[PDB]
């Protein structure tokens, strides 16, 4: 088979827990999961991305979903992926969302 979206990723938010005396602890908890395609940037896009203060590592293509926010996080293959900029809906047609991101070390869990 030849799937447009052969991967499975997890979306995570940064939410508050408070219990007992007064508490400030924030935890990354899961929101939902989706089918996606995670691609490294091309050889020509690498030299363009090196002239930025935060260089881009990955393009993530997923079906359109209005729950996706720019302050979210992605877990993919045991690694943390951090968003760079705002999510983009391709051509305004509400079919496919592209997210730019970078790797941020290993995930425990």
């Amino acid at each position: 088979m030849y799937e447009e979206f052969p991967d499975v990723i997890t979306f995570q938010s940064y939410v508050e827990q408070s219990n007992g005396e007064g508490g400030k602890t924030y935890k990354w908890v899961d929101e939902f999961t989706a089918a996606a395609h995670v691609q490294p940037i091309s050889q020509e896009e690498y030299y363009k991305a090196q002239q930025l203060q935060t260089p881009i590592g990955y393009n993530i293509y997923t079906p359109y979903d209005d729950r996706i926010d720019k302050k979210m996080r992605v877990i993919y293959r045991g690694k943390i992926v951090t968003f760079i900029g705002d999510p983009v809906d391709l051509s305004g047609l509400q079919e496919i969302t592209r997210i730019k991101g970078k790797e941020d070390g290993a995930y425990v869990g």
């Binding site: 088979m1 030849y2 447009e4 395609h37 691609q39 091309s42 393009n59 293509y61």
Partner: protein, 102 residues
């Protein structure tokens, strides 16, 4: 036809295609029997599928994993061009067993 033998003929190692193959392989065996007008039965009444029918069933099951309404696709670094017909060298895997309908 055994599903694991089809997976060995198509170089498949995982179990991603198992539910599709379990449905698609016996249908293709019955289609070869109906299209050649040949029940593939030996002297003792036992079913003996010939080797060329087996090659045909495996390659047609690999062909029908594509999308029927699509000839090409592209996403940003990947691109694919698909074949629209089964090739004639695979369709000629039924020819030495063809009988006439009665």
């Amino acid at each position: 036809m055994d599903i694991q033998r089809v997976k060995r003929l198509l170089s498949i190692t995982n179990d991603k295609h198992d539910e599709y193959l379990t449905e698609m392989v016996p249908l293709l065996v019955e289609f070869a029997k109906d299209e050649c007008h040949n029940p593939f039965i030996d002297k003792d009444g036992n079913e003996s599928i010939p080797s060329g029918v087996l090659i045909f069933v495996a390659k047609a099951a690999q062909f029908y994993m594509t999308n029927a309404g699509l000839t090409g696709r592209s996403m940003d670094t990947v691109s694919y061009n698909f074949a629209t017909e089964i090739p004639s060298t695979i369709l000629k895997k039924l020819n030495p067993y063809r009988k006439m309908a009665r």
